[PDB]
Amino acid sequence: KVFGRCELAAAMKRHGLDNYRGYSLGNWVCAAKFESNFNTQATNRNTDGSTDYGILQINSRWWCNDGRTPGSRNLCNIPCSALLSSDITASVNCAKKIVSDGNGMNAWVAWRNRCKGTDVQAWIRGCRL
C-alpha cells in the first residue's frame, strides 16, 4: 500500500506514535516519506547483507527475522515480511522499540539527514487529526 500523507499521519496517530519518546507526528511522517515514500512494500538491501523493510525501513540486522542476515537478531520478534503489510501495526510496534534503544530517531539515517531540525510540522499540515 502507498499511503497518502494525511492517511499515514492518521494511522500513526491511531497507533500511538504521535509524541512517542517525544517525537512529534511530523517527525514520523517525514521519516516515512524519505525512508519508503509511504510505500508499505518498500525493501532495500544494504551493503552488509541486511535488508530494510516497510514504511519505516526497519532493518534485519537487529530488528526482524528474514532468514538471510547472518549473525543478526530479531529484537522485535517478527518476520521481516510482517513489516510489509498494509496494516502498519507491526512496523509501529517495532519502531517504538527502536526509538527507545538510546539514539532516538537517529536510528533512521534518512530522518537524521533529511528531517532532523527541519519544519517537520509541514508533514501534517492540512490533515484532519
Tab-separated table of N, CA, C and O in Angstrom:
chain	number	residue	atom	x	y	z
A	1	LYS	N	0.851	-1.214	0.000
A	1	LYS	CA	0.000	0.000	0.000
A	1	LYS	C	0.859	1.224	0.000
A	1	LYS	O	1.821	1.313	0.793
A	2	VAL	N	0.484	2.175	-0.836
A	2	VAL	CA	1.086	3.503	-0.866
A	2	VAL	C	0.178	4.481	-0.168
A	2	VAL	O	-0.930	4.790	-0.694
A	3	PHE	N	0.569	4.841	1.049
A	3	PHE	CA	-0.249	5.757	1.862
A	3	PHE	C	-0.200	7.122	1.310
A	3	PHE	O	0.784	7.560	0.762
A	4	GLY	N	-1.317	7.843	1.483
A	4	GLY	CA	-1.326	9.269	1.377
A	4	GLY	C	-0.747	9.868	2.647
A	4	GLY	O	-0.802	9.242	3.699
A	5	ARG	N	-0.173	11.052	2.527
A	5	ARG	CA	0.474	11.753	3.624
A	5	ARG	C	-0.465	11.871	4.852
A	5	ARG	O	-0.191	11.372	5.980
A	6	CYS	N	-1.607	12.508	4.662
A	6	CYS	CA	-2.527	12.642	5.797
A	6	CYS	C	-3.119	11.301	6.291
A	6	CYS	O	-3.384	11.096	7.478
A	7	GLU	N	-3.269	10.325	5.392
A	7	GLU	CA	-3.725	8.983	5.764
A	7	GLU	C	-2.741	8.257	6.692
A	7	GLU	O	-3.150	7.616	7.635
A	8	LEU	N	-1.458	8.352	6.348
A	8	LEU	CA	-0.408	7.781	7.191
A	8	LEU	C	-0.364	8.502	8.540
A	8	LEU	O	-0.265	7.845	9.575
A	9	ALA	N	-0.479	9.837	8.530
A	9	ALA	CA	-0.420	10.621	9.782
A	9	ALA	C	-1.550	10.103	10.724
A	9	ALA	O	-1.330	9.873	11.913
A	10	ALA	N	-2.751	9.862	10.174
A	10	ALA	CA	-3.868	9.371	10.960
A	10	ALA	C	-3.588	7.994	11.515
A	10	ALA	O	-3.946	7.676	12.656
A	11	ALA	N	-2.952	7.119	10.718
A	11	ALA	CA	-2.704	5.773	11.184
A	11	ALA	C	-1.627	5.789	12.236
A	11	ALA	O	-1.755	5.131	13.266
A	12	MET	N	-0.622	6.631	12.032
A	12	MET	CA	0.433	6.712	13.033
A	12	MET	C	-0.086	7.227	14.370
A	12	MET	O	0.260	6.727	15.436
A	13	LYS	N	-1.010	8.191	14.288
A	13	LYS	CA	-1.624	8.746	15.495
A	13	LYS	C	-2.449	7.703	16.194
A	13	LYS	O	-2.343	7.532	17.404
A	14	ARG	N	-3.271	7.004	15.433
A	14	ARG	CA	-4.125	5.984	15.993
A	14	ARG	C	-3.312	4.910	16.760
A	14	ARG	O	-3.698	4.487	17.852
A	15	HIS	N	-2.168	4.522	16.180
A	15	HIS	CA	-1.295	3.540	16.748
A	15	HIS	C	-0.294	4.061	17.773
A	15	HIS	O	0.580	3.294	18.200
A	16	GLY	N	-0.396	5.325	18.196
A	16	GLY	CA	0.313	5.781	19.408
A	16	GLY	C	1.711	6.341	19.146
A	16	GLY	O	2.458	6.616	20.081
A	17	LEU	N	2.010	6.610	17.882
A	17	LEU	CA	3.323	7.181	17.539
A	17	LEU	C	3.481	8.728	17.767
A	17	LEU	O	4.595	9.264	17.954
A	18	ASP	N	2.387	9.464	17.795
A	18	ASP	CA	2.436	10.895	17.914
A	18	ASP	C	2.920	11.351	19.327
A	18	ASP	O	2.300	11.045	20.360
A	19	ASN	N	4.079	12.021	19.352
A	19	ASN	CA	4.876	12.288	20.539
A	19	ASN	C	5.440	11.096	21.340
A	19	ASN	O	5.861	11.202	22.502
A	20	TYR	N	5.593	9.968	20.663
A	20	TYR	CA	6.143	8.823	21.312
A	20	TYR	C	7.642	9.088	21.476
A	20	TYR	O	8.288	9.568	20.529
A	21	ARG	N	8.184	8.861	22.684
A	21	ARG	CA	9.561	9.254	23.016
A	21	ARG	C	9.837	10.752	22.689
A	21	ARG	O	10.987	11.156	22.480
A	22	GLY	N	8.808	11.578	22.718
A	22	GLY	CA	8.948	12.988	22.441
A	22	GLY	C	9.041	13.460	21.018
A	22	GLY	O	9.211	14.644	20.749
A	23	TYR	N	8.811	12.527	20.088
A	23	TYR	CA	8.874	12.830	18.635
A	23	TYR	C	7.456	13.105	18.091
A	23	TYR	O	6.620	12.219	18.087
A	24	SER	N	7.274	14.349	17.684
A	24	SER	CA	6.005	14.765	17.121
A	24	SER	C	5.635	13.933	15.875
A	24	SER	O	6.494	13.381	15.153
A	25	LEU	N	4.331	13.849	15.610
A	25	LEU	CA	3.849	13.151	14.410
A	25	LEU	C	4.522	13.544	13.131
A	25	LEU	O	4.834	12.645	12.299
A	26	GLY	N	4.822	14.821	12.924
A	26	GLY	CA	5.558	15.289	11.734
A	26	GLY	C	6.898	14.571	11.522
A	26	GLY	O	7.291	14.321	10.385
A	27	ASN	N	7.628	14.322	12.606
A	27	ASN	CA	8.879	13.572	12.544
A	27	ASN	C	8.674	12.188	11.945
A	27	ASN	O	9.497	11.763	11.120
A	28	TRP	N	7.632	11.516	12.375
A	28	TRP	CA	7.397	10.139	11.922
A	28	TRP	C	6.996	10.136	10.484
A	28	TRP	O	7.383	9.211	9.715
A	29	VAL	N	6.127	11.072	10.114
A	29	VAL	CA	5.656	11.180	8.735
A	29	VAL	C	6.804	11.487	7.793
A	29	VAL	O	6.929	10.874	6.722
A	30	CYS	N	7.643	12.462	8.165
A	30	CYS	CA	8.815	12.832	7.441
A	30	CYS	C	9.779	11.614	7.257
A	30	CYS	O	10.271	11.362	6.152
A	31	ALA	N	9.998	10.884	8.332
A	31	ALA	CA	10.848	9.686	8.259
A	31	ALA	C	10.281	8.705	7.271
A	31	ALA	O	11.041	8.205	6.396
A	32	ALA	N	8.990	8.467	7.355
A	32	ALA	CA	8.367	7.525	6.401
A	32	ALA	C	8.470	7.994	4.968
A	32	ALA	O	8.735	7.201	4.025
A	33	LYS	N	8.256	9.285	4.739
A	33	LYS	CA	8.383	9.823	3.414
A	33	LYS	C	9.774	9.501	2.789
A	33	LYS	O	9.852	8.980	1.655
A	34	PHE	N	10.850	9.772	3.540
A	34	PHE	CA	12.143	9.610	2.955
A	34	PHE	C	12.656	8.179	3.058
A	34	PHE	O	13.565	7.757	2.303
A	35	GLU	N	12.118	7.408	3.987
A	35	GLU	CA	12.536	6.008	4.071
A	35	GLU	C	11.881	5.194	2.962
A	35	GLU	O	12.570	4.417	2.283
A	36	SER	N	10.576	5.328	2.751
A	36	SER	CA	9.803	4.400	1.904
A	36	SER	C	8.927	5.073	0.849
A	36	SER	O	8.263	4.401	0.058
A	37	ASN	N	8.915	6.407	0.838
A	37	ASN	CA	7.936	7.172	0.027
A	37	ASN	C	6.508	6.713	0.289
A	37	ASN	O	5.632	6.644	-0.600
A	38	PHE	N	6.237	6.383	1.556
A	38	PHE	CA	4.953	5.980	2.043
A	38	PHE	C	4.439	4.626	1.518
A	38	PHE	O	3.258	4.262	1.732
A	39	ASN	N	5.386	3.812	1.007
A	39	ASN	CA	5.061	2.511	0.426
A	39	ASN	C	5.308	1.401	1.430
A	39	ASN	O	6.514	1.184	1.779
A	40	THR	N	4.272	0.692	1.917
A	40	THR	CA	4.472	-0.392	2.853
A	40	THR	C	5.297	-1.532	2.300
A	40	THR	O	5.900	-2.210	3.106
A	41	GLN	N	5.377	-1.667	0.976
A	41	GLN	CA	6.118	-2.802	0.360
A	41	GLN	C	7.538	-2.547	0.122
A	41	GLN	O	8.223	-3.429	-0.403
A	42	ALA	N	8.022	-1.350	0.457
A	42	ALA	CA	9.403	-0.949	0.161
A	42	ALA	C	10.444	-1.890	0.847
A	42	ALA	O	10.330	-2.167	2.011
A	43	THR	N	11.430	-2.335	0.060
A	43	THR	CA	12.522	-3.115	0.594
A	43	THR	C	13.818	-2.561	-0.002
A	43	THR	O	13.835	-2.134	-1.149
A	44	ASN	N	14.910	-2.581	0.757
A	44	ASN	CA	16.166	-2.079	0.250
A	44	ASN	C	17.320	-2.850	0.881
A	44	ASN	O	17.357	-2.996	2.116
A	45	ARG	N	18.154	-3.442	0.035
A	45	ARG	CA	19.257	-4.294	0.514
A	45	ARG	C	20.383	-3.398	0.877
A	45	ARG	O	20.771	-2.514	0.106
A	46	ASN	N	20.967	-3.689	2.014
A	46	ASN	CA	22.132	-2.945	2.453
A	46	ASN	C	23.407	-3.640	2.085
A	46	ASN	O	23.426	-4.857	1.771
A	47	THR	N	24.497	-2.871	2.138
A	47	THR	CA	25.813	-3.376	1.718
A	47	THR	C	26.305	-4.552	2.573
A	47	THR	O	27.062	-5.433	2.074
A	48	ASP	N	25.904	-4.559	3.841
A	48	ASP	CA	26.310	-5.571	4.836
A	48	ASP	C	25.515	-6.882	4.710
A	48	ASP	O	25.763	-7.838	5.447
A	49	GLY	N	24.593	-6.910	3.755
A	49	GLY	CA	23.742	-8.083	3.536
A	49	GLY	C	22.383	-8.041	4.212
A	49	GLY	O	21.567	-8.931	4.000
A	50	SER	N	22.189	-7.106	5.132
A	50	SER	CA	20.892	-6.969	5.802
A	50	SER	C	19.956	-6.251	4.779
A	50	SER	O	20.416	-5.780	3.733
A	51	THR	N	18.660	-6.205	5.106
A	51	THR	CA	17.637	-5.572	4.294
A	51	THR	C	16.742	-4.735	5.205
A	51	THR	O	16.461	-5.096	6.351
A	52	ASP	N	16.281	-3.593	4.654
A	52	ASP	CA	15.371	-2.704	5.333
A	52	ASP	C	13.981	-2.954	4.736
A	52	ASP	O	13.838	-3.040	3.467
A	53	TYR	N	12.978	-3.043	5.605
A	53	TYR	CA	11.587	-3.427	5.234
A	53	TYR	C	10.540	-2.406	5.667
A	53	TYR	O	10.491	-2.026	6.826
A	54	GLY	N	9.643	-2.092	4.763
A	54	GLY	CA	8.387	-1.442	5.076
A	54	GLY	C	8.456	0.078	5.197
A	54	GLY	O	9.439	0.710	4.782
A	55	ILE	N	7.342	0.631	5.680
A	55	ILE	CA	7.123	2.078	5.651
A	55	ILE	C	8.187	2.853	6.394
A	55	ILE	O	8.503	3.985	6.092
A	56	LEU	N	8.775	2.219	7.393
A	56	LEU	CA	9.859	2.805	8.134
A	56	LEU	C	11.225	2.091	7.975
A	56	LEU	O	12.231	2.349	8.675
A	57	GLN	N	11.319	1.274	6.941
A	57	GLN	CA	12.611	0.681	6.570
A	57	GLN	C	13.416	0.110	7.755
A	57	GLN	O	14.633	0.377	7.902
A	58	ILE	N	12.704	-0.752	8.496
A	58	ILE	CA	13.217	-1.490	9.686
A	58	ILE	C	14.181	-2.602	9.214
A	58	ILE	O	13.891	-3.331	8.267
A	59	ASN	N	15.366	-2.602	9.812
A	59	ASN	CA	16.471	-3.416	9.325
A	59	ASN	C	16.611	-4.793	9.967
A	59	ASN	O	16.475	-4.943	11.186
A	60	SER	N	16.936	-5.782	9.133
A	60	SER	CA	17.006	-7.191	9.586
A	60	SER	C	18.251	-7.457	10.447
A	60	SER	O	18.266	-8.490	11.056
A	61	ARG	N	19.259	-6.582	10.470
A	61	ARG	CA	20.488	-6.785	11.373
A	61	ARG	C	20.097	-6.970	12.822
A	61	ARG	O	20.573	-7.887	13.489
A	62	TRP	N	19.211	-6.118	13.327
A	62	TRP	CA	18.745	-6.200	14.702
A	62	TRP	C	17.347	-6.527	14.974
A	62	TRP	O	17.012	-7.049	16.026
A	63	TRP	N	16.428	-6.094	14.103
A	63	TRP	CA	15.069	-5.948	14.493
A	63	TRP	C	14.035	-6.991	14.061
A	63	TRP	O	13.032	-7.168	14.723
A	64	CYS	N	14.287	-7.641	12.920
A	64	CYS	CA	13.345	-8.602	12.391
A	64	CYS	C	14.081	-9.776	11.800
A	64	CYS	O	15.256	-9.676	11.488
A	65	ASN	N	13.368	-10.896	11.646
A	65	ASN	CA	13.965	-12.070	11.004
A	65	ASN	C	13.583	-12.230	9.533
A	65	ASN	O	12.414	-12.313	9.224
A	66	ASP	N	14.596	-12.271	8.694
A	66	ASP	CA	14.408	-12.598	7.259
A	66	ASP	C	15.103	-13.876	6.851
A	66	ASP	O	15.004	-14.222	5.665
A	67	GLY	N	15.761	-14.563	7.776
A	67	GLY	CA	16.431	-15.803	7.404
A	67	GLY	C	17.666	-15.703	6.547
A	67	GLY	O	18.267	-16.745	6.249
A	68	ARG	N	18.129	-14.514	6.155
A	68	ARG	CA	19.294	-14.345	5.306
A	68	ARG	C	20.229	-13.181	5.749
A	68	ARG	O	20.953	-12.604	4.916
A	69	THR	N	20.219	-12.911	7.043
A	69	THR	CA	21.106	-11.889	7.619
A	69	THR	C	22.024	-12.548	8.684
A	69	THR	O	21.695	-12.570	9.829
A	70	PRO	N	23.187	-13.054	8.263
A	70	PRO	CA	23.919	-13.871	9.251
A	70	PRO	C	24.370	-13.061	10.451
A	70	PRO	O	24.855	-11.907	10.316
A	71	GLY	N	24.124	-13.615	11.626
A	71	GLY	CA	24.617	-13.089	12.901
A	71	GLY	C	23.621	-12.127	13.467
A	71	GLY	O	23.840	-11.588	14.521
A	72	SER	N	22.507	-11.939	12.770
A	72	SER	CA	21.515	-10.923	13.127
A	72	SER	C	20.620	-11.356	14.286
A	72	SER	O	20.486	-12.551	14.642
A	73	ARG	N	20.011	-10.350	14.902
A	73	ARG	CA	18.970	-10.551	15.834
A	73	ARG	C	17.609	-10.197	15.231
A	73	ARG	O	17.515	-9.788	14.042
A	74	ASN	N	16.602	-10.451	16.045
A	74	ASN	CA	15.185	-10.290	15.797
A	74	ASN	C	14.536	-9.737	17.042
A	74	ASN	O	13.733	-10.363	17.688
A	75	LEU	N	14.968	-8.549	17.388
A	75	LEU	CA	14.564	-7.974	18.701
A	75	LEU	C	13.079	-7.575	18.760
A	75	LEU	O	12.471	-7.420	19.844
A	76	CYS	N	12.457	-7.382	17.597
A	76	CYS	CA	11.015	-7.145	17.578
A	76	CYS	C	10.160	-8.411	17.485
A	76	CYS	O	8.936	-8.340	17.479
A	77	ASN	N	10.848	-9.552	17.421
A	77	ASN	CA	10.217	-10.848	17.370
A	77	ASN	C	9.176	-11.011	16.294
A	77	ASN	O	8.050	-11.391	16.541
A	78	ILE	N	9.567	-10.670	15.080
A	78	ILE	CA	8.679	-10.697	13.937
A	78	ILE	C	9.459	-11.089	12.692
A	78	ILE	O	10.654	-10.744	12.549
A	79	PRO	N	8.780	-11.812	11.776
A	79	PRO	CA	9.345	-11.902	10.428
A	79	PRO	C	9.374	-10.563	9.752
A	79	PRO	O	8.447	-9.785	9.911
A	80	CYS	N	10.431	-10.284	8.999
A	80	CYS	CA	10.509	-9.001	8.342
A	80	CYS	C	9.332	-8.770	7.385
A	80	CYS	O	8.928	-7.647	7.138
A	81	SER	N	8.819	-9.835	6.800
A	81	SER	CA	7.612	-9.763	5.974
A	81	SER	C	6.417	-9.097	6.601
A	81	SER	O	5.668	-8.427	5.910
A	82	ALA	N	6.257	-9.233	7.917
A	82	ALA	CA	5.201	-8.545	8.618
A	82	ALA	C	5.270	-7.025	8.527
A	82	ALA	O	4.266	-6.319	8.719
A	83	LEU	N	6.459	-6.525	8.296
A	83	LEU	CA	6.696	-5.098	8.173
A	83	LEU	C	6.280	-4.584	6.780
A	83	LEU	O	6.380	-3.366	6.502
A	84	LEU	N	5.770	-5.458	5.892
A	84	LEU	CA	5.353	-5.022	4.578
A	84	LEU	C	3.828	-4.955	4.432
A	84	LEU	O	3.307	-4.622	3.368
A	85	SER	N	3.124	-5.199	5.516
A	85	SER	CA	1.702	-5.282	5.457
A	85	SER	C	1.049	-3.914	5.215
A	85	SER	O	1.614	-2.854	5.496
A	86	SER	N	-0.171	-3.945	4.697
A	86	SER	CA	-0.914	-2.730	4.508
A	86	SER	C	-1.289	-2.156	5.884
A	86	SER	O	-1.407	-0.952	6.025
A	87	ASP	N	-1.435	-3.005	6.883
A	87	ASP	CA	-1.689	-2.556	8.245
A	87	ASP	C	-0.333	-2.296	8.917
A	87	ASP	O	0.510	-3.206	8.948
A	88	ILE	N	-0.138	-1.069	9.417
A	88	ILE	CA	1.185	-0.642	9.959
A	88	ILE	C	1.490	-1.032	11.403
A	88	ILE	O	2.577	-0.670	11.942
A	89	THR	N	0.602	-1.800	12.056
A	89	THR	CA	0.781	-2.167	13.459
A	89	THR	C	2.172	-2.758	13.741
A	89	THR	O	2.858	-2.301	14.665
A	90	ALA	N	2.612	-3.772	12.991
A	90	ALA	CA	3.909	-4.382	13.328
A	90	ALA	C	5.045	-3.374	13.194
A	90	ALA	O	6.001	-3.348	14.024
A	91	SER	N	4.977	-2.546	12.148
A	91	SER	CA	6.038	-1.528	11.925
A	91	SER	C	6.056	-0.529	13.062
A	91	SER	O	7.139	-0.145	13.549
A	92	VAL	N	4.860	-0.062	13.447
A	92	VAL	CA	4.776	0.868	14.593
A	92	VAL	C	5.273	0.266	15.906
A	92	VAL	O	6.046	0.879	16.627
A	93	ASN	N	4.873	-0.964	16.224
A	93	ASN	CA	5.336	-1.606	17.455
A	93	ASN	C	6.853	-1.758	17.492
A	93	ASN	O	7.470	-1.590	18.523
A	94	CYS	N	7.418	-2.106	16.343
A	94	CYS	CA	8.843	-2.301	16.278
A	94	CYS	C	9.567	-0.935	16.324
A	94	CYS	O	10.594	-0.774	17.031
A	95	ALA	N	8.998	0.067	15.653
A	95	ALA	CA	9.554	1.439	15.711
A	95	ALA	C	9.657	2.004	17.112
A	95	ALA	O	10.625	2.671	17.477
A	96	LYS	N	8.635	1.714	17.901
A	96	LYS	CA	8.679	2.112	19.279
A	96	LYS	C	9.856	1.520	20.048
A	96	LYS	O	10.490	2.206	20.846
A	97	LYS	N	10.127	0.219	19.865
A	97	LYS	CA	11.307	-0.383	20.475
A	97	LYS	C	12.613	0.283	19.969
A	97	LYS	O	13.548	0.588	20.755
A	98	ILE	N	12.671	0.551	18.671
A	98	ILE	CA	13.877	1.122	18.078
A	98	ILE	C	14.161	2.495	18.665
A	98	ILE	O	15.268	2.788	19.095
A	99	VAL	N	13.154	3.360	18.634
A	99	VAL	CA	13.293	4.734	19.083
A	99	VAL	C	13.555	4.832	20.587
A	99	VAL	O	13.969	5.882	21.070
A	100	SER	N	13.298	3.735	21.318
A	100	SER	CA	13.629	3.661	22.729
A	100	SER	C	15.024	3.154	23.029
A	100	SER	O	15.386	3.156	24.170
A	101	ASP	N	15.796	2.740	22.013
A	101	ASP	CA	17.058	1.977	22.128
A	101	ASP	C	18.240	2.834	22.573
A	101	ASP	O	19.264	2.267	22.966
A	102	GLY	N	18.101	4.161	22.517
A	102	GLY	CA	19.114	5.100	23.110
A	102	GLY	C	19.439	6.316	22.242
A	102	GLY	O	19.793	7.382	22.771
A	103	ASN	N	19.298	6.168	20.914
A	103	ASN	CA	19.692	7.219	19.982
A	103	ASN	C	18.479	7.893	19.347
A	103	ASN	O	18.624	8.771	18.492
A	104	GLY	N	17.296	7.564	19.865
A	104	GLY	CA	16.130	8.215	19.407
A	104	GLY	C	15.952	7.921	17.937
A	104	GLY	O	16.245	6.805	17.452
A	105	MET	N	15.427	8.921	17.237
A	105	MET	CA	15.197	8.765	15.801
A	105	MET	C	16.436	8.816	14.956
A	105	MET	O	16.358	8.541	13.771
A	106	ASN	N	17.605	9.040	15.539
A	106	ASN	CA	18.823	8.965	14.766
A	106	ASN	C	19.112	7.573	14.227
A	106	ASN	O	19.933	7.442	13.311
A	107	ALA	N	18.419	6.586	14.785
A	107	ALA	CA	18.426	5.224	14.245
A	107	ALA	C	18.050	5.207	12.775
A	107	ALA	O	18.442	4.287	12.049
A	108	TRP	N	17.229	6.178	12.332
A	108	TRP	CA	16.834	6.266	10.948
A	108	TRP	C	17.681	7.280	10.282
A	108	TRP	O	17.544	8.470	10.512
A	109	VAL	N	18.608	6.823	9.430
A	109	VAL	CA	19.612	7.707	8.872
A	109	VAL	C	18.953	8.776	8.009
A	109	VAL	O	19.372	9.936	8.123
A	110	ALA	N	17.892	8.437	7.280
A	110	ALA	CA	17.157	9.447	6.462
A	110	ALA	C	16.457	10.438	7.342
A	110	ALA	O	16.319	11.593	6.948
A	111	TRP	N	16.032	10.045	8.547
A	111	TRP	CA	15.474	11.064	9.468
A	111	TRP	C	16.580	12.049	9.895
A	111	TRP	O	16.420	13.286	9.858
A	112	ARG	N	17.751	11.540	10.262
A	112	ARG	CA	18.809	12.436	10.714
A	112	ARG	C	19.226	13.387	9.604
A	112	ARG	O	19.410	14.588	9.825
A	113	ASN	N	19.337	12.844	8.405
A	113	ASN	CA	19.898	13.627	7.298
A	113	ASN	C	18.898	14.536	6.627
A	113	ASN	O	19.302	15.538	6.006
A	114	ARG	N	17.616	14.223	6.719
A	114	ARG	CA	16.599	14.921	5.944
A	114	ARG	C	15.450	15.543	6.703
A	114	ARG	O	14.698	16.359	6.115
A	115	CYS	N	15.231	15.113	7.936
A	115	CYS	CA	14.101	15.542	8.747
A	115	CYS	C	14.560	16.349	9.962
A	115	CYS	O	13.924	17.367	10.311
A	116	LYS	N	15.547	15.831	10.667
A	116	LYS	CA	16.023	16.420	11.928
A	116	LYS	C	16.283	17.891	11.728
A	116	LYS	O	16.986	18.285	10.811
A	117	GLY	N	15.679	18.685	12.611
A	117	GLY	CA	15.888	20.112	12.600
A	117	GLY	C	15.017	20.907	11.660
A	117	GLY	O	14.997	22.134	11.748
A	118	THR	N	14.362	20.227	10.737
A	118	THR	CA	13.514	20.869	9.732
A	118	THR	C	12.113	21.179	10.271
A	118	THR	O	11.696	20.756	11.370
A	119	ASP	N	11.312	21.868	9.464
A	119	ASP	CA	9.922	22.160	9.858
A	119	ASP	C	9.026	20.945	9.564
A	119	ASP	O	8.303	20.885	8.546
A	120	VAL	N	9.155	19.944	10.441
A	120	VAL	CA	8.510	18.662	10.244
A	120	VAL	C	7.010	18.812	10.374
A	120	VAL	O	6.286	17.991	9.882
A	121	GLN	N	6.503	19.884	11.029
A	121	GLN	CA	5.065	20.051	11.113
A	121	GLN	C	4.400	20.177	9.730
A	121	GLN	O	3.213	19.871	9.554
A	122	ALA	N	5.171	20.617	8.752
A	122	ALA	CA	4.686	20.700	7.374
A	122	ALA	C	4.106	19.388	6.916
A	122	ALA	O	3.177	19.324	6.118
A	123	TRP	N	4.671	18.283	7.425
A	123	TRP	CA	4.214	16.959	7.001
A	123	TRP	C	2.847	16.574	7.436
A	123	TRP	O	2.249	15.682	6.856
A	124	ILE	N	2.295	17.296	8.430
A	124	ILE	CA	0.957	17.002	8.926
A	124	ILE	C	0.052	18.225	8.713
A	124	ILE	O	-1.095	18.193	9.140
A	125	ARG	N	0.558	19.246	8.040
A	125	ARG	CA	-0.272	20.442	7.645
A	125	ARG	C	-1.487	20.057	6.838
A	125	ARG	O	-1.418	19.259	5.909
A	126	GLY	N	-2.644	20.619	7.203
A	126	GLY	CA	-3.869	20.338	6.486
A	126	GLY	C	-4.572	19.032	6.805
A	126	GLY	O	-5.662	18.807	6.320
A	127	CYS	N	-3.959	18.150	7.598
A	127	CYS	CA	-4.546	16.851	7.894
A	127	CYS	C	-5.563	16.958	8.989
A	127	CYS	O	-5.338	17.589	10.013
A	128	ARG	N	-6.659	16.242	8.819
A	128	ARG	CA	-7.650	16.208	9.860
A	128	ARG	C	-7.274	15.218	10.990
A	128	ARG	O	-7.627	14.031	10.931
A	129	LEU	N	-6.593	15.701	12.027
A	129	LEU	CA	-6.056	14.783	13.060
A	129	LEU	C	-6.699	14.947	14.432
A	129	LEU	O	-7.173	16.033	14.824
